[PDB]
Amino acid sequence: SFSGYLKLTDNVYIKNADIVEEAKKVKPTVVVNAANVYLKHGGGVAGALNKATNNAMQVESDDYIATNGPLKVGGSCVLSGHNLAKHCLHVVGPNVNKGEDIQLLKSAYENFNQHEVLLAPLLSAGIFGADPIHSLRVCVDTVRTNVYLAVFDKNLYDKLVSSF
Numbered sequence: 665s666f667s668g669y670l671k672l673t674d675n676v677y678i679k680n681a682d683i684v685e686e687a688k689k690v691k692p693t694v695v696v697n698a699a700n701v702y703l704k705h706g707g708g709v710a711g712a713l714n715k716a717t718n719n720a721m722q723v724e725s726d727d728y729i730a731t732n733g734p735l736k737v738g739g740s741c742v743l744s745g746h747n748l749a750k751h752c753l754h755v756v757g758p759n760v761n762k763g764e765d766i767q768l769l770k771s772a773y774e775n776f777n778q779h780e781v782l783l784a785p786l787l788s789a790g791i792f793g794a795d796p797i798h799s800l801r802v803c804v805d806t807v808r809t810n811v812y813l814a815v816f817d818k819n820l821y822d823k824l825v826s827s828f
């Protein structure tokens with residue numbers, strides 16, 4: 665039920681929207697979380713998604729980590745979407761502020777290819793420290809499935825479209 669999106673390519677779409685509000689409106693099959701390897705959803709997209717689930721996402725994530733250990737940078741896991749989606753694909757993009765290799769951003773986007781359609785943020789952008797224009801280019805050049813990108817900041821949305 666996605667609406668108001670601008671088509672960038674055959675499979676990539678973009679909208680100036682809060683991913684939490686977009687998830688509550690659409691209730692997609694898959695919402696992507698901008699996760700860290702420990703699934704500690706403190707801030708950014710992860711903190712906002714977890715807060716919308718009344719912390720049920722953090723409780724579920726802590727049990728997952730206790731059983732399986734941390735994810736790899738560039739890796740992912742599928743957990744419940746709670747009240748936002750059927751599923752949440754927790755994807756770990758490299759955190760540039762922590763010295764993580766930006767080359768892992770392509771591996772992180774490759775996780776999207778296991779799902780026919782997804783609502784997602786730009787990986788590694790925001791508090792993760794990477795250039796969002798770079799993140800959109802890697803998204804477009806890596807993801808082959810249908811991805812609906814929610815870009816929170818209006819000025820960033822405008823720059824992303826103008827420079828595409």
Ligand SMILES: CS(=O)(=O)Nc1cccc([C@@H](CC(=O)O)NC(=O)c2ncnc3[nH]ccc23)c1
Pocket residue numbers: 681682683684707708709710712785786789790791792796814815816817820
């Ligand atoms: C530094 S920047 O990436 O160019 N600018 C930026 C400006 C404002 C925000 C951001 C990042 C910050 C971050 O969550 O780590 N936000 C998002 O990517 C985002 N996207 C969709 N829906 C959302 N709901 C809550 C956050 C959010 C980034």
